[PDB]
Amino acid sequence: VTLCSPTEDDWPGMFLLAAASFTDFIGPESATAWRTLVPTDGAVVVRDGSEVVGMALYMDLRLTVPGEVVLPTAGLSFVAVAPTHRRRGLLRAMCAELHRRIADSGYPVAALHASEGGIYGRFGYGPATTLHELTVDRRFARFHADAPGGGLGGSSVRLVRPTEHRGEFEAIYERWRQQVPGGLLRPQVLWDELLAEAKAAPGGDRESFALLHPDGYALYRVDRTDLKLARVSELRAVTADAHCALWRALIGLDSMERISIITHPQDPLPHLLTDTRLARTTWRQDGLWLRIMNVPAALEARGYAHEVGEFSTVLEVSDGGRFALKIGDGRARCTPTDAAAEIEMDRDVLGSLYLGAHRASTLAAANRLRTKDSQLLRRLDAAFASDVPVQTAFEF
Amino acid sequence: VTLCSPTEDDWPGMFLLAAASFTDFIGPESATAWRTLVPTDGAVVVRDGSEVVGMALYMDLRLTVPGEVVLPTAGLSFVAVAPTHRRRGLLRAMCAELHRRIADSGYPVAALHASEGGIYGRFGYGPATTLHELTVDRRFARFHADAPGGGLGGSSVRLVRPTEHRGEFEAIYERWRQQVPGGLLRPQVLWDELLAEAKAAPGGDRESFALLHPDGYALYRVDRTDLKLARVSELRAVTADAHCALWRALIGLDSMERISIITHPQDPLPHLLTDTRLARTTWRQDGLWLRIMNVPAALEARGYAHEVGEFSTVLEVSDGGRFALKIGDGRARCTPTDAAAEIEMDRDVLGSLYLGAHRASTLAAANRLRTKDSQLLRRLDAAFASDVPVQTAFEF
Amino acid sequence: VTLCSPTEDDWPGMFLLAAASFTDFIGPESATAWRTLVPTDGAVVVRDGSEVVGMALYMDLRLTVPGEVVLPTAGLSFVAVAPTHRRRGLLRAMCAELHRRIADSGYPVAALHASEGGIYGRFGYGPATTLHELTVDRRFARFHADAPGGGLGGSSVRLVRPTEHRGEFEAIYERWRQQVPGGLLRPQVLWDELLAEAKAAPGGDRESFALLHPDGYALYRVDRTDLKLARVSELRAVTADAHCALWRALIGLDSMERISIITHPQDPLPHLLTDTRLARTTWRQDGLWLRIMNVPAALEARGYAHEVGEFSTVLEVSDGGRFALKIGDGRARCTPTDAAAEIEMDRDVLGSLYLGAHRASTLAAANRLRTKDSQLLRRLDAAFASDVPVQTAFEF
Amino acid sequence: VTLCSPTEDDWPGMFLLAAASFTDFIGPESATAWRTLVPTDGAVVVRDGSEVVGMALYMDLRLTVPGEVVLPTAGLSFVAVAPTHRRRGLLRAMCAELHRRIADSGYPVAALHASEGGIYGRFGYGPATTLHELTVDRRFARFHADAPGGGLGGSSVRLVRPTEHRGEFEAIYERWRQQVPGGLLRPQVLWDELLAEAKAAPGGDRESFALLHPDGYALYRVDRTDLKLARVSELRAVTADAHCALWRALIGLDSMERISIITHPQDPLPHLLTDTRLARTTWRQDGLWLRIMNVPAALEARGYAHEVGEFSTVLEVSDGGRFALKIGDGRARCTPTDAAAEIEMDRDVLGSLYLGAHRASTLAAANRLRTKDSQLLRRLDAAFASDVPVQTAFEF
Ligand SMILES: Nc1nc(SCCCN2CCCCC2)nc2sc3c(c12)CC[C@H](c1ccccc1)C3
Ligand SMILES: Nc1nc(SCCCN2CCCCC2)nc2sc3c(c12)CC[C@H](c1ccccc1)C3
Ligand SMILES: Nc1nc(SCCCN2CCCCC2)nc2sc3c(c12)CC[C@H](c1ccccc1)C3
Ligand SMILES: Nc1nc(SCCCN2CCCCC2)nc2sc3c(c12)CC[C@H](c1ccccc1)C3
Ligand SMILES: [Mg+2]
Ligand SMILES: [Mg+2]
Ligand SMILES: [Mg+2]
Ligand SMILES: [Mg+2]
Ligand code: NA
Ligand code: NA
Ligand code: NA
Ligand code: NA
Ligand code: NA
Ligand code: NA
Ligand code: NA
Numbered sequence A, B, C, D: 001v002t003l004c005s006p007t008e009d010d011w012p013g014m015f016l017l018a019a020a021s022f023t024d025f026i027g028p029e030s031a032t033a034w035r036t037l038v039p040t041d042g043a044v045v046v047r048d049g050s051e052v053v054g055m056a057l058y059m060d061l062r063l064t065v066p067g068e069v070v071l072p073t074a075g076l077s078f079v080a081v082a083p084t085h086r087r088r089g090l091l092r093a094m095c096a097e098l099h100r101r102i103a104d105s106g107y108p109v110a111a112l113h114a115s116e117g118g119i120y121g122r123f124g125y126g127p128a129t130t131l132h133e134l135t136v137d138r139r140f141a142r143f144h145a146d147a148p149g150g151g152l153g154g155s156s157v158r159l160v161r162p163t164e165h166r167g168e169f170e171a172i173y174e175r176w177r178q179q180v181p182g183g184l185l186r187p188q189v190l191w192d193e194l195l196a197e198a199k200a201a202p203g204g205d206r207e208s209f210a211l212l213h214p215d216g217y218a219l220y221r222v223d224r225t226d227l228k229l230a231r232v233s234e235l236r237a238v239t240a241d242a243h244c245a246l247w248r249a250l251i252g253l254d255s256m257e258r259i260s261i262i263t264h265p266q267d268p269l270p271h272l273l274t275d276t277r278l279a280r281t282t283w284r285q286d287g288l289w290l291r292i293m294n295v296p297a298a299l300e301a302r303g304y305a306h307e308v309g310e311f312s313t314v315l316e317v318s319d320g321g322r323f324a325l326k327i328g329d330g331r332a333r334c335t336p337t338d339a340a341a342e343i344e345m346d347r348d349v350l351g352s353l354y355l356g357a358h359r360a361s362t363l364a365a366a367n368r369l370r371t372k373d374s375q376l377l378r379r380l381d382a383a384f385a386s387d388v389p390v391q392t393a394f395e396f
C-alpha cells in the first residue's frame, strides 16, 4: 500500500475504479478533455501489491473571488477508495500528499464538489456556495409591471441550436465568470464536452435548446420522463435586462407546466413575478467547498465591503497560524503575530466565510467561530459580505 | 352591497363565511380568544340585502423591529369574500376602509399572513420574513466537536408536559419576542389557545411534549400518519447554549427517523452537525407581510447598521410621498422634500426591506427598486440589514 | 338452511352480518330510517340451525322513467351471504323468493346498486344509468361569453347551512325527481339521514356547506385528507340558469384547486367553460340497475321519442315472453303473440335500454340483442332514447 | 414580422421551432412523409428580420362524415409560435391567412388535434369526436354466453409481424375509414411511417405485434416500463365478429394483467364481458376538432337520420350567415334567408354537432346554442345524431 504518481499504465485501473465509484462517469473518451486540466504531479494513486485501490488528483482552475479578483485554485476531483479497501486510512494519506503538493506549488486555495456533506470538513474544506433549485409553475406566472423588457417591438432573445453559437456563449460566460464570486474560467475542452451533452442520447437525454440574448444565455432540455418539465441546465446573464428577457422566454414555453433551475439564493426571479410564491424552492445543497491553503495570501487577495470602517483584530486558525488582521478601504493586511487571539476558527470555517455565502454571526451561534466581542462579529459579517452575490460555476 | 362595522347579530354570518373560507377554522369557541385582540371598529362586513358576503378585520399587535424597537401593528386577518360574490371589488373596498381606520388610528405599520402570494402586493404588502422547513434525518446526526453542551455531568433540558410549565414558556417567549425582529407579544388568551392544542384530539393530532431549558423551549408532537416523524411546532431559544442543548435533546428522540421544523434561513442548526447536509431544506415560503402605513414614522422608528457610515438620499414611494432620508449612528431622520428622487419603489417593496429579510440589491436586479447610483444601493443594503436575523413569531 | 321472513328477534343477527358485509354500514340507529321503507314481507333471512347466514330485502321506491312517468319500484338492498356460507346457492334462493314476492305484489320493475358488476346480470338486472366523475381544476376555469348569469348586479346563489334550509332543498329535489329519468322520491326519513351527514364527524368527514338558488342547490364538503379538493355530494338544478349559477359559485371556491362531482354523461358543465378539457372525466361506473318484472306493463308505462314514426315488431325476452310491440305518438302497445320474433334479448338487456342510457345498436354489436333488420335497430335506438338525459338519484 | 409562404431555405428554421415546440417530433426524416400531404401554399411562416418565430400549415385530408360521405378536409397541423414571440398576435395572423387559403381553395371543412382545449374555440373549431381509454383487467375477464366466436373449431385470428401484412391492414383500414364518421384516408407514406414505429427502438418502445382477422386487425405493444400492460395502439374491425374475435385474442395475452386502448364512447367491448365494469374508463378527451368553412356546403353534404320526419327552420351562425334549413329523407337543403332566426350558434358549436358526437340539447343547456322552441331542439338532436357511432382515425 505505497502512494505514487500514476504513469499511463495506471490509467486503465483508474477508469475501472472511476466507473465503480461514480455513476455519472461517461468513460475514457470524456476523460481526455479533463486530463488536460490535471498538471504533471497533480494525481496520486494507491496500488496494492497490482491494481489501483485509491486515487485523487487536482485540476488547475481560476476561481473569481469578491473584488473581481481571480485566484489560481487547485480543484480536487476523481477522489475514490476501492470498496475492498475502506477504513484503511487511504483518503487521509492521499489528501495529505495532494495538500502538500498544492501548498508547495503556490495555490492559495483548493476547492471541490462534495459527494457527501460529512467527509471534507475534517480535511479543512468549508461549504462556500449554496445551490438553490427554483421550480416555476409557469401556467400561473405573470411578470410584474416594474419588470424590464415587457414593452412593444421585437424581443432581443433568440431560440437557437447551442452548437451553432459556441463563440457567443463563450464570450458571455467569460464576462460572467470574471464579474461573479464563484466563477471559474471554462477552458475550450470543457465547452467541447458541454456541447456534446447538448445533443440527444438514444434512450437517454433529449435535445438541448438555447435562448440567446446579447448579454445572456439559457441552455434547457425537456426532462427524460416528465414531459411537462423543462430543466434549465445553465443560465448566464451579465445584465438584469438579459436575466429578465431570458425568463420571459422560458415562461413562454407554453407546452411545459414547470421550469426548474439550480441557481443561487439571491436569484431575483421571484421578484420578477406578481406572485413571488410561484418560484418554489424545491432543493438546497452546498455547492463549492474551499480549503484556504495560505491564510494571509487568501485574506489579502480578496476585496472587502467599503461600507464598514477600518478595524483591526487577531484571527487564530486552528493549526493554521495567528495573524494581525487589519481591514479598511476594502483591502486587508494580514501579518504574523503572537498577540492574544480575539477570533478563533477551524480552517474549514474560513473557507465558508471567504466568498460571503455564510455570515460570521451564524457560524458564531454554532460556536464554529469563537469571539468575546459581538462588535467584532458585526464588523467581520459586514466586511466579508459580498456586494455581487456568490454563484456556483460548474461541477468538477 | 353596503360596507359596515359588524354588530353581535352579524357574528353567526361571519363564522359561516369563516368555516366555508378557511379549513383550519376551529369554530366559535376559539373565536372568543382572538376576538379580544380586535379593537372596537377593527372589523368590516359586507351584507347583501341579509347574510355576510364579505368580512375583514385587524388585531392590535406589537411587532419587534431591528434595534429591539416595538411598533404598534394592525394585524390584518379573517379576510373572506363569499364564493357567490367574487370579482365584485369587495376586497378592494374592505381593504381600503380598514387601511383608512388603521392609518387614522396611528398604526405606523399593518401586517398579515398570505393564503396566496399574488393577492397582497397590489394593496402595498411586501413579504418581510422567510419561513424555512428543515428536516433532520436524526439517525445520521453527530454534533461537531465545537458544539456547546456536549461535556460530562447532567443535561439542563427537561422533558415536560407543556401545560404544567405555562409560566416558564411565557417568560422565555417574552424575552425572545423583545429581542428578535419579527417577534410579536403573545397575549394570555393565545397561550390559553396554544396549550389547548398541546393535548391529543380524538382521530386528530397526538399529545405535544415539551423540552424545557432555563433559556429556551421546544414544543413537538409525532405526526398523525408518519410515526417516524417529529414535528417541532415551536422552538424559542434566547441563548446559543439553549438552542444547541434543545437540539441535542431532539436528536435524542431515538424512536424517530426525522425531525422537522419551520425556522428562519439563518438558523445555526446545520453548523451544529458534522454533516451540514443532514439538515435538508424541504420547504420555503413568505412568512409575515408588512404594509408601511406611515413612511417617515416607520423609517425613523427602526435601528440601522452602525457599520455603514453616515449618508443622505431622496426616497420616493409610489403614491406614498418623497422624503429626504439621512442615516447615521444607526438612526434615520426622514423629512418631506420636493428634491429630485435618487431611489423610487412601490410601498410593498419598502415592507420587504423593512425587517432586513430582503436585500435592496436583489429587489433592484428585479427593477422593483430604481436608482442610478450603485454606491447608494450598497449603502441601503448595509444600513437596512439586521444584526439579529429576522424570524416569524406566530400566524394570525 | 331454511328461507324465512325475519322477526324482530332476527335483527341483531342481520346487523352483525351487515357490519361484516358492508364497510359503509353506520349501525342500528340509521337502520331505523331505512326500515320504514321496507314493507311487511319485504325481507328474507337464511338461518343455520341459530344465527343469520343470509339476508335480502326490497324497499318501496318511486322511480321516474321517460315521459315523466313514475313507477312503483322494488329497490333491492342489504343483500349479504356470510363468509362462512359462500358457494351454497343462498343468493340464488333469496333472490328467487324476493322476485316472486315483488312480481306477486304488482311491481313492474325492481332496481339495485351493484357492489360488483358481475353478479346481477344472471338474475335479470341490467345497468340502466351511468355515473360520471368530473374533476374541475378551478384555477384555470373561465366561463364562456355565452354562459348564463355572468352579468352585473347581485348573484341569486346563497352560501347556507344545509340544516337551516331543509324545506327549500326538499321542494327543489321534489321538482327535480318528477322531471328526470332515474329520479327517486326521497322520503322524510332519508332527508333526516342526509342532514345528519351534513355536520362534521370527529376524526371523520368535514362540515358540509350548501349553495342555494331559487331553482337549484349543491351540497359540498372539503375532502378529509386532500384540503385543496371540494367534493360536491349532490347538485340538483331544475333550470339551466340554476345549473350555471351554482357552478359559477363552486368555481368561486378560491381556496380549492379542484372541484369533483359524480354526475351523468350529458352534464353540460364542460360547455360552460372556454376550455372544455378543464372538466376531466376521472371515473365512470354503472349506477342504477333495472330488472323489468313485467315486460308489457313496463314497455307500455314509459313514453317514447315522438320524432321516430309509427312502427311494429315482435320482441322476445329470453324466458320472459314474446310480444307484439307497436310504438307511435310516443306511446307503446305491447300484447302477447306467437308470431316469429324479429328481436330477441335476455331480460337484463331490456333493463339497460329502458331509461335510454344504452343504445340498442351498441348492445346489438355485442350480440346481447339479436335482429336481422338494421332498420328496426335504428327505430328502437330512436324510440327508446330519452329527451331529458337519465341521471342517478341516490344510492340504496 | 411579415407573414410568408416558406421556401426550402426556411425548412431548417421550421424543424428547429418544431423540435422546441413538440416533444413527439421525430426529426427531419419523418417530416419527408407528411410533407407530401401539404399542398403548394399550404404553409405560412413568420420571419423576424432572419429565423422562423411562427409557422402553420394544412394537409389535404379526406374525412368521412355521416351517410358514408367523404369531404375534402384541410387538416391544420405543425402550428407553433416561438417562446420568444408570445402574446404578439402571431397565431391570430397565421390562422387568418390559412383560413382564407383553405376557404378560397374550396375546402368545406378544416380539422385539427388540439394540444390544449382552450385555444381553438375562438378560431371557430369545435371538438367533434371523443377519445375514451378503456383499461381491461384481463385476469377477471370472461366473455358473455351471447358473445360471438366462442364455439369449437379453429380461431380465424392470427398473431403476425405487422410489417409482413401491410397489404391486409391497408385493405381493412380502407374499408373501415369509408364506413365510419371520423375516418381519414391514410396514404402510403403514413403506412410507411406506421410500420417503422412497429419495430423496437433501442431504449425506447418495444416490438409491436399484430392480431389479423379477415375483417379486422389490432396493433399492440407491451408498455416500456409497466411489463404487465399491453397498449393497443390501433384496432380496426369492419364487422362485430372481427371486433369480438380480436378481443378474445387480446384477453388471451395471459402474461399481461391489463389491456388498454383509446377507443370511442360507444365501443361495445364492455357488453362482450359478463362483468361490464372490468372495462374501466381511465381517460376521456376531445379527439378531432372541426371548423365548418362553408355552412351550406357542409350541412348539405352529410346524411341525416331517416327516423325524424321532415322539418324546416332558420339557423344563424354568428358572423357565419343565416340559412333556411329544411331536413327530410335524411338530406338537407340549406339556402340564404333574411327571415327571423329560430336557432343561433357560434361556428365552433356547429363543428361539435356535425359528426353526431355532441347532442344539440346538451349544448343548448350550456346556452352555446339558442332556440325558444324545445320541439326544434329534439328534431336537431335526432336529425344530426349518427347511426354508425363517430370514431377518431389518426392524429395529425
Ligand atoms: N473532474 C472530472 N469531472 C467530470 S464531470 C463533473 C461532475 C462530477 N462531480 C464530481 C463529484 C461531485 C459532484 C459531481 N468528469 C471527469 S473525467 C476525469 C476527471 C473528471 C478528472 C481527471 C481524470 C483523469 C484520471 C486519470 C488520468 C487522467 C485524468 C478524468
Ligand atoms: N386571526 C385568527 N386566527 C386564527 S388561527 C391563525 C392561522 C390562520 N392563518 C391565517 C391565514 C394564513 C395562514 C393561517 N383563528 C381565529 S378565530 C378569529 C380570528 C382568528 C380573528 C378574529 C375573529 C372574529 C370574527 C368575528 C367577530 C369577532 C372576532 C375570530
Ligand atoms: N338500503 C340501505 N342503505 C343504506 S346507505 C346506501 C349505500 C349503500 N349502497 C349499497 C350497495 C352498493 C352501493 C352502496 N343504509 C341502510 S341501513 C338498512 C338499509 C340501508 C335497508 C333496510 C335495513 C333493515 C334490515 C333489517 C331490518 C330492518 C331494516 C336497514
Ligand atoms: N402533421 C404532422 N404530424 C406528425 S405526428 C402527429 C402527432 C402530433 N399531434 C399533433 C398535436 C396534437 C396531438 C399530436 N409529424 C409530422 S412532421 C411534419 C408534419 C407532421 C406536418 C408537415 C411538416 C412540414 C414542415 C415544413 C415543411 C414541410 C413539411 C412536417
Ligand atoms: Mg462563502
Ligand atoms: Mg424584511
Ligand atoms: Mg337505460
Ligand atoms: Mg360531432
Ligand atoms: Na438543439
Ligand atoms: Na441543457
Ligand atoms: Na408576492
Ligand atoms: Na469599524
Ligand atoms: Na404532554
Ligand atoms: Na406541538
Ligand atoms: Na458539512
Ligand code: NA
Binding pocket: B308, B309, B310, B311, B379
Ligand atoms: Na456611507
Ligand code: NA
Binding pocket: C160, C161, C162, C198, C207, C208, C209, C210
Ligand atoms: Na355547515
Ligand code: NA
Binding pocket: C198, C208, C209, C219, C220, C221, C231, C232, C233, C234
Ligand atoms: Na356533502
Ligand code: NA
Binding pocket: C274, C275, C276, C277, D117, D118, D121, D127
Ligand atoms: Na374547448
Ligand code: NA
Binding pocket: C308, C309, C310, C311, C379
Ligand atoms: Na318508423
Ligand code: NA
Binding pocket: D160, D161, D162, D198, D207, D208, D209, D210
Ligand atoms: Na413484431
Ligand code: NA
Binding pocket: D198, D208, D209, D219, D220, D221, D231, D232, D233, D234
Ligand atoms: Na403498437
Ligand code: NA
Binding pocket: C117, C118, C121, C127, D274, D275, D276, D277
Ligand atoms: Na355487468
Ligand code: NA
Binding pocket: D308, D309, D310, D311, D379
Ligand atoms: Na319533424
